[PDB]
Amino acid sequence: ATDPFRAAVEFTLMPMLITNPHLPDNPIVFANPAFLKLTGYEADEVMGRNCRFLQGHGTDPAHVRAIKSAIAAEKPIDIDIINYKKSGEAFWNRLHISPVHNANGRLQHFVSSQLDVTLELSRLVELEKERKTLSIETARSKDQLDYIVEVANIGFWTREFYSGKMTCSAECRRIYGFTPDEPVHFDTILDLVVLEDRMTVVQKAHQAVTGEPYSIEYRIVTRLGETRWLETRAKALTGENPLVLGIVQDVTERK
Amino acid sequence: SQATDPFRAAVEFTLMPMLITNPHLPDNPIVFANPAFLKLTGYEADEVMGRNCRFLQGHGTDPAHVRAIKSAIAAEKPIDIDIINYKKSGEAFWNRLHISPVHNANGRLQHFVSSQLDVTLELSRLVELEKERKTLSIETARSKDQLDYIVEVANIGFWTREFYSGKMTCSAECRRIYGFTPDEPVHFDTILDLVVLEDRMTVVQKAHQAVTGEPYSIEYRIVTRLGETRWLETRAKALTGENPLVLGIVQDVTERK
Ligand SMILES: Cc1cc2nc3c(=O)[nH]c(=O)nc-3n(C[C@H](O)[C@H](O)[C@H](O)COP(=O)(O)O)c2cc1C
Ligand SMILES: Cc1cc2nc3c(=O)[nH]c(=O)nc-3n(C[C@H](O)[C@H](O)[C@H](O)COP(=O)(O)O)c2cc1C
């Protein structure tokens, strides 16, 4: 005849405590295996003492007063406080404390459900401020790039080695017959290339990536019918899915 | 029954969903569910009792996960396993499950107790935070690779300046225009020493006045360390946000008046 609730508290993964308020200083009279494992204390090392022994230097004094006022008022309380393991390792202890009254209405026990939320209040929180930091830097480093190609008027383009997706500057879109807003793929450039230069272009474009800079020159017939001679100095960014960089310029004058 | 059972109360008041089943009854039905469990699933108390815990399951739920629990229960062994379940509304969620067998003194199986936890949006949050960091790491590194490539290949006199501080960065072409050495530290004052005194006041004021994110141009005369007089044009713009940064492109336009 085993008590299923006793066994539930016994076998749960979540730390639980029970204190007897009728004794002085309201000491711990029970601690499930989960609690002893989290804090690293043995059973005989936590019995008989108040739960304030888990506190330390990083423990917010304001958090302690809240718990004190709740216990003195015999009222429940949920709070996140900084506690310490036997080794010294600090951890965020999500505290859920509930008073237990008898039939008459007198206080009989205090029970609590401790939960280690260190990875939420300490790990996730910094990963949110770390990610936000990267966003600024990413947006900035791009703002420098976009500003240079604009005021220096450079036909700058990028190309994904596999998908063939591209980005083009204002100058690059003027060299070809492109509009400032339309999406640009490697195929929309290939459509402008003269018939005789096409095979040379796509073979160089789909050639095995090397971190070395290379030059390539081909002719295009723009969408208005104007034949233009282009020169391009390109370089591939090594990776699993490389990004090809390239600066194109119109050299039709004096071929 | 004057005094309450603290263990009973602990399970009652906890925010962790907990179930108790009686394996002596057919198909091992639920005989208890704390208020925590009823809020998670959205079922009433009388809508859970007498049922097996498989009613939370449905489509998308891996049948391999079920057989793992099935074999664990049959062997009277504890088991930790995540699984897909369905709350009353139909909303699917991930159920972190911790089941433990309860034996008496004789070794006779009496009960099963469990801990339930909703870890759907929890695991989903971190699997997107670790894929987001990888992308932004590559992007920043590559957008930095793009910048240096353009400046070098296109021979641009490009400089950056922390507006408040005054510390500057200079490209190879930028240093050749003013007449700097490729490895000396460059401050805004270092440039001012070369600017002619007639145009010197007009330069500092224009650089000082505009902290906004509005583009502006300025042209002045300088004299290098060797004495060469050069007319310059600088097109600059400051990036508003936290510690400001002034970007500027300068080209030598030594052409006759
Ligand atoms: C059941 C129960 C469990 C408690 N568990 C913790 C705990 O895990 N960590 C902690 O810092 N305080 C815990 N406390 C609160 C402390 O025992 C103590 O009441 C609090 O630090 C204020 O003590 P003070 O009034 O002497 O300053 C718990 C209190 C109760 C009643
Ligand atoms: C105490 C206890 C709690 C359980 N809780 C769940 C649960 O929350 N979700 C679930 O899918 N299965 C849960 N199960 C397992 C199911 O009740 C069922 O035994 C298991 O899915 C295999 O049953 P089947 O092979 O007939 O499909 C629990 C089992 C026990 C003993």
Residue numbers in the entry:
A (entry chain A): 19 to 273
B (entry chain B): 17 to 273
What does the paper behind this entry write?
To address whether these differences are indeed light-induced structural changes or whether they are simply due to different constructs crystallized under different conditions, we conducted dynamic crystallographic experiments to examine the light-induced structural changes in the photoactive LOV-PAS crystals. We collected 22 crystallographic data sets by subjecting the LOV-PAS crystals to various dark and light conditions at room temperature before freezing. Although the dark and light crystals belong to the same space group, they show small yet consistent differences in their cell parameters. In the light LOV-PAS structure, all four subunits exhibit the tilting of FMN toward the Eα helix forming stronger H-bonds with Gln132. It is highly possible that the FMN tilting results from the widely reported light-induced adduct formation between the FMN-C4a and Cys69-Sγ atoms, which is not fully resolved in our electron density maps. In addition to the FMN tilting, the LOV domain moves concertedly as a rigid body in response to light. Specifically, the LOV domains undergo partial separation across the dimer interface in both the AB and CD dimers, which is also evidenced by the increased intersubunit distances in the light-minus-dark difference distance matrices. Partial separation between the LOV domains results in a destabilized or altered dimer interface between the N-terminal parts of the Jα helices. Instead of moving with their respective LOV domains, the tethered Jα helices in both the AB and CD dimers move together sideways perpendicular to the helical spine, resulting in asymmetric responses between the partner subunits. Although these motions observed in the LOV-PAS crystals are small in amplitude due to lattice restraints, they are compatible with the Jα tilting captured by the light LOV-PAS-HK structure, where the helical tilting is coupled to unwinding of the helical spine, eventually leading to a large rotation of the PAS dimer relative to the LOV dimer.
